[PDB]
Amino acid sequence: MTEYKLVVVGAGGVGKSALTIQLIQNHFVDEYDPTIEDSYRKQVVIDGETCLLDILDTAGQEEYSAMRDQYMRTGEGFLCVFAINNTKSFEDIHHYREQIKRVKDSEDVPMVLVGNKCDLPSRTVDTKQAQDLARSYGIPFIETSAKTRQGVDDAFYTLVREIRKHKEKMSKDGKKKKKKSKTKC
Amino acid sequence: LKLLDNWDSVTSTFSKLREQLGPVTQEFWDNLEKETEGLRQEMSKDLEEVKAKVQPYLDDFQKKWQEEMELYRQKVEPLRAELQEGARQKLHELQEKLSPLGEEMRDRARAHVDALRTHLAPYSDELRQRLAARLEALKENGGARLAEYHAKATEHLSTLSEKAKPALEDLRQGLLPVLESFKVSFLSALEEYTKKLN
Amino acid sequence: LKLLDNWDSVTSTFSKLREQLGPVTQEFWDNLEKETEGLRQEMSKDLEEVKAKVQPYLDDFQKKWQEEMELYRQKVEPLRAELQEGARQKLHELQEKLSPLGEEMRDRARAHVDALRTHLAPYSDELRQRLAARLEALKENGGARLAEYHAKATEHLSTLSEKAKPALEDLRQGLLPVLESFKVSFLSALEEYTKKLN
Amino acid sequence: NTIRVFLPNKQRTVVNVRNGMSLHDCLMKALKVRGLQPECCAVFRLLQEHKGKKARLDWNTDAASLIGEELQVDFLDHVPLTTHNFARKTFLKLAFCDICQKFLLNGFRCQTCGYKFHEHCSTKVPTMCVDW
Lengths: 185, 198, 198, 132
Ligand SMILES: CCCCCCCC/C=C\CCCCCCCC(=O)OC[C@H](COP(=O)(O)OCC[N+](C)(C)C)OC(=O)CCCCCCC/C=C\CCCCCCCC
Ligand SMILES: CCCCCCCC/C=C\CCCCCCCC(=O)OC[C@H](COP(=O)(O)OCC[N+](C)(C)C)OC(=O)CCCCCCC/C=C\CCCCCCCC
Ligand SMILES: CCCCCCCC/C=C\CCCCCCCC(=O)OC[C@H](COP(=O)(O)OCC[N+](C)(C)C)OC(=O)CCCCCCC/C=C\CCCCCCCC
Ligand SMILES: CCCCCCCC/C=C\CCCCCCCC(=O)OC[C@H](COP(=O)(O)OCC[N+](C)(C)C)OC(=O)CCCCCCC/C=C\CCCCCCCC
Ligand SMILES: CCCCCCCC/C=C\CCCCCCCC(=O)OC[C@H](COP(=O)(O)OCC[N+](C)(C)C)OC(=O)CCCCCCC/C=C\CCCCCCCC
Ligand SMILES: CCCCCCCC/C=C\CCCCCCCC(=O)OC[C@H](COP(=O)(O)OCC[N+](C)(C)C)OC(=O)CCCCCCC/C=C\CCCCCCCC
Ligand SMILES: CCCCCCCC/C=C\CCCCCCCC(=O)OC[C@H](COP(=O)(O)OCC[N+](C)(C)C)OC(=O)CCCCCCC/C=C\CCCCCCCC
Ligand SMILES: CCCCCCCC/C=C\CCCCCCCC(=O)OC[C@H](COP(=O)(O)OCC[N+](C)(C)C)OC(=O)CCCCCCC/C=C\CCCCCCCC
Ligand SMILES: CCCCCCCC/C=C\CCCCCCCC(=O)OC[C@H](COP(=O)(O)OC[C@H](N)C(=O)O)OC(=O)CCCCCCC/C=C\CCCCCCCC
Ligand SMILES: CCCCCCCC/C=C\CCCCCCCC(=O)OC[C@H](COP(=O)(O)OC[C@H](N)C(=O)O)OC(=O)CCCCCCC/C=C\CCCCCCCC
Ligand SMILES: CCCCCCCC/C=C\CCCCCCCC(=O)OC[C@H](COP(=O)(O)OC[C@H](N)C(=O)O)OC(=O)CCCCCCC/C=C\CCCCCCCC
Ligand SMILES: Nc1nc2c(ncn2[C@@H]2O[C@H](COP(=O)(O)OP(=O)(O)NP(=O)(O)O)[C@@H](O)[C@H]2O)c(=O)[nH]1
Ligand SMILES: [Zn+2]
Ligand SMILES: [Zn+2]
Prior knowledge:
Chain D: Belongs to the protein kinase superfamily. TKL Ser/Thr protein kinase family. RAF subfamily. Chain D: This is RAF proto-oncogene serine/threonine-protein kinase. The complex is a heterotetramer, with one copy of chain A, two copies of chain B and one copy of chain D. Helices cover about 35% and strands about 25% of the residues of chain A. By secondary structure, chain A is an alpha/beta fold. Chain A has helices at about 15-25, 65-75, 85-105, 125-135, 150-175; strands at about 1-10, 35-45, 50-55, 75-85, 110-115, 140. In chain A, strands 2-3-1-4-5-6 form a six-stranded mixed sheet, sandwiched between helices. Chain B is an all-alpha fold. Chain D is built from one helix and eight strands. In chain D, a hairpin with a 5-residue loop joins strand 7 (about 110) and strand 8 (about 115). Chain D is elongated.
């Protein structure tokens, strides 16, 4: 079984742990319980082969920690989960996005954007805003909901699919990017 | 600006559609509510009467089914008896044949196989003699074929050498300037691509 | 340009093939004679001795066939009578079932079909009342939807034309110079291509 | 305040408690998520200079006083580790059975593990979901 290091990030109150518990234990939470160090590992089957998903939860209510940089560096897949019912969460993504870049020491990493609480009438952030945003950074966006449990499984499968193609792409492109450029005359 | 401008036109259309979507869903949901409302009142007929009338319906069919089950049970008893008594007689009748004719079949099989063994006895030995001649014929001839094949192969290898050395050399030496000129055309073609497509 | 040079070498190979063909076919011919005569050594034996194989084997087999054939007349034939009697008894058993149970089943069906005349038949009419109301709802909602659809059709027509005009206008405005630029690129490409592939 | 909540086998869930919560308070949070009974479980604190045995604590112990301490709730009436839980959930994608020689249909798979098997693989593969 292939092991995958998955790390989730996001602001506090977006329903980060809600997604994990709803996907792993298949249960829902209602109590606002802040997480510090949660470890969820489930054995599933993605694209035929057995896939062991190792997800490490984060603390939404925390500042810059050296210990956070440690386990975040061990993560290969990053999921930016935010609630579209809060403008702060949409802006906070920029902080985390740049943070991950520094931690992984790479400007290009496997990250997926997810707008939780999409079934709530408090949706202030429009899908178009997220679509345009994600498009500008070359990342995908999923309208996941823990309450409805829709788009949950696929959101995680998306990361694995991109990671597989990423590792494969590494040996295909070879950090070449482009060849030669020439203008007219 | 080609794709950007064309896209912008689509963006305006999408934005316009959004302003239409609202009234559309608002009116559609209003009409849908009328549809569901009617169905809600119809539910007080469809489901209500289906459940109210289901009682006499089910009771009737169930009562009849019970009678059918009763009749089936009252018939299955004596009928199964005839079936069993008849089966016993039919099976016993078969047994009365399976025993004597069965033993006879075994005895006949003894002779059937006896004749087979007795006939196959000299046959198998003769087959061994046949095989011996068959194999030896292919052995004596085989040695000749192998010898000839080796000779033919060697002669084929010498002629193959004329292809591997003289022919191949000329082919390579001939293809050399061809590949060189090919590279030239390919180089210019590369430029053509970048000069027109970039 | 050296197409004949390559063709020459290819022809040399053909010449070498001819050089092999001669001796090869000659020895292969003798080989074939070796094989034919060799095979004939075993074939003659096989054919002549097969007479003392197939004949007695057919006799041995026919003897078993005759035995079995006669045995079938002493087994299958009388068993056919046993089968006839068994079937006749079963048919008799069936007659005392198909008829009584048949009439009973028909009578059951009577009670079922007749029940459906008071169950399904009236319900079909009761459903008509509901369907009439449903159809009425679909008619009222339909008339509304028709009006809304027709109205939205005009709205869509206005939005479409409002965008189609500038779209086609701008598209034409951009197509003119862009096509010219493409033509220039195509012409310069063709000229150069004709130079590379001349 | 950092309470290192450790679970049986090899799981950990460091939650954030405050005010005046006891072990049972935090336990209730995990209890509803796990869906298990505390009757077969017991609260064992960190081995404070011990020979090699867990120290059984009380259920009404203050969690704040255990700031920085590692508490583990193991089974005293049941068995620890993870168990191969049978799941009869239908598939979404036709993941081939590389364990067998044919295709995989509406078979079965574990919930805790990911052992994909047919109706024949059940009592065919001797290698159970045991991976150390
Ligand atoms: C059985 C008879 C079906 C046909 C009935 C007549 C036609 C009805 C009209 C449409 C069909 C609706 C079918 C609804 C039930 C689907 C059940 C199903 O078997 O679902 C399978 C897919 C598989 O994929 P997955 O596991 O990756 O997805 C889900 C990933 N997870 C679970 C994280 C949830 O899972 C899912 O559907 C997720 C659960 C279902 C979500 C439905 C969302 C519907 C909303 C909008 C519909 C838009 C349709 C647009 C059509 C455009 C045509 C050009
Ligand atoms: C008249 C009809 C046309 C009308 C105009 C167009 C309407 C279009 C409708 C909606 C607009 C959006 C359409 C979809 C656009 C995106 C398509 C696409 O994303 O393209 C690429 C994907 C790649 O997928 P991936 O897994 O490699 O990457 C997954 C993502 N990544 C790379 C992380 C991991 O392609 C795939 O996903 C393959 C998905 C294959 C799904 C097969 C479903 C078969 C089910 C039923 C058959 C009939 C369907 C139609 C029924 C119509 C009824 C009326
Ligand atoms: C065009 C050529 C192909 C045509 C194919 C179809 C031909 C036949 C025509 C229609 C048959 C359609 C059959 C499918 C209908 C939709 C089924 C469906 O999957 O829909 C899904 C949606 C979304 O949720 P979900 O289920 O996907 O997600 C939760 C479930 N999960 C886990 C699996 C995701 O459901 C919803 O949006 C909300 C649904 C609310 C339903 C309320 C029902 C209340 C009961 C009665 C109301 C009064 C009835 C009066 C009499 C009416 C007679 C007609
Ligand atoms: C004239 C023109 C030129 C010449 C033309 C004719 C050339 C003939 C030359 C060769 C032909 C050889 C044909 C036989 C080749 C195999 C001989 C053999 O090596 O056979 C061994 C078997 C071993 O059986 P077993 O009990 O050890 O294993 C039983 C295992 N379990 C329980 C599945 C079934 O021998 C047995 O089965 C016998 C006991 C079981 C019999 C079952 C029914 C067989 C079908 C018909 C009856 C045959 C009776 C005689 C034996 C026939 C054998 C095929
Ligand atoms: C060609 C034009 C087509 C136009 C659209 C309509 C096409 C209709 C054609 C055929 C009928 C398809 C009906 C599909 C119904 C939903 C199936 C489904 O998505 O099942 C999803 C579940 C998900 O997992 P679970 O835990 O819920 O099930 C655990 C196993 N379990 C069932 C036994 C508890 O997996 C399962 O059910 C296990 C797999 C079997 C599920 C059987 C569900 C049957 C439901 C209704 C019967 C069919 C009604 C429509 C008949 C139309 C005839 C023309
Ligand atoms: C009176 C009778 C009339 C019959 C009319 C139709 C005749 C059709 C011909 C033969 C019969 C075929 C019957 C197929 C039955 C499939 C049943 C089924 O349920 O299958 C399901 C699987 C997917 O898994 P699942 O649903 O079990 O679970 C989904 C997740 N859960 C468990 C919730 C619900 O379906 C899949 O995998 C599909 C994956 C995508 C495959 C795309 C194939 C595209 C190629 C051709 C299709 C082109 C369509 C448009 C026209 C093209 C003309 C050239
Ligand atoms: C709307 C339906 C209306 C039906 C009306 C009645 C008639 C229906 C006709 C046929 C029935 C079709 C039924 C289809 C049922 C399944 C639909 C479906 O499931 O639809 C989406 C899936 C992909 O779902 P997903 O990946 O989330 O997997 C979800 C499962 N889970 C979690 C592993 C990854 O479709 C697939 O699986 C197929 C494979 C997709 C592969 C995409 C990625 C391909 C990768 C590279 C492509 C490279 C192309 C290069 C150029 C080629 C030129 C030829
Ligand atoms: C008038 C002119 C007449 C001309 C006649 C000659 C030309 C005929 C035309 C084409 C040649 C066809 C040759 C036979 C192709 C058989 C394909 C096939 O599927 O036969 C069935 C076996 C069944 O196997 P199963 O039931 O044990 O497992 C499941 C297998 N399953 C998922 C298909 C569900 O399939 C399998 O064994 C597949 C097992 C896995 C194979 C993986 C291979 C991966 C590498 C390449 C894939 C190439 C795929 C090519 C598909 C071509 C489709 C036309
Ligand atoms: C025997 C004959 C064999 C050949 C048959 C050929 C004809 C087959 C007939 C039909 C083929 C239809 C092929 C349809 C392929 C559709 C591919 C596609 O993009 O699916 C996109 C999504 C499904 O993936 P998602 O990325 O959304 O993952 C799940 C999602 N997160 C969730 O939580 O729900 O579903 C949707 O977006 C809903 C789209 C609804 C409209 C789709 C409209 C689709 C219309 C055109 C697009 C077709 C795309 C086909 C695949 C192209 C891949 C490059
Ligand atoms: C000005 C150029 C600028 C640069 C352009 C670069 C890009 C060029 C790329 C594409 C441009 C050309 C694009 C051409 C697209 C043609 C598309 C087309 O017509 O398809 C149909 C043709 C039909 O042929 P025909 O009618 O002969 O055959 C019909 C067939 N018998 C029947 O009865 O069914 O199929 C065929 O002709 C196939 C057989 C042909 C046999 C004769 C083949 C003849 C080929 C060459 C002739 C000899 C050349 C010798 C070398 C010259 C250079 C040194
Ligand atoms: C005018 C047109 C003319 C067309 C002519 C076509 C000629 C084709 C000729 C040959 C084709 C191949 C024919 C192969 C025939 C079978 C050959 C065969 O048995 O090989 C051995 C395999 C062994 O499988 P195992 O399960 O044991 O795998 C492990 C393996 N033994 C090991 O550990 O080493 O057997 C298996 O079944 C393994 C695969 C099991 C799944 C198979 C799944 C199905 C795979 C293939 C199906 C092929 C069907 C071909 C139908 C042709 C009809 C004409
Ligand atoms: N209505 C609704 N609420 C959700 C959804 N997902 C999460 N929430 C809510 O978001 C709030 C926090 O959820 P949870 O993830 O447990 O805590 P969190 O705020 O994310 N902190 P953390 O992820 O660190 O534990 C709770 O009210 C939870 O119910 C959802 O899909 N729908
Ligand atoms: Zn299997
Ligand atoms: Zn298991």
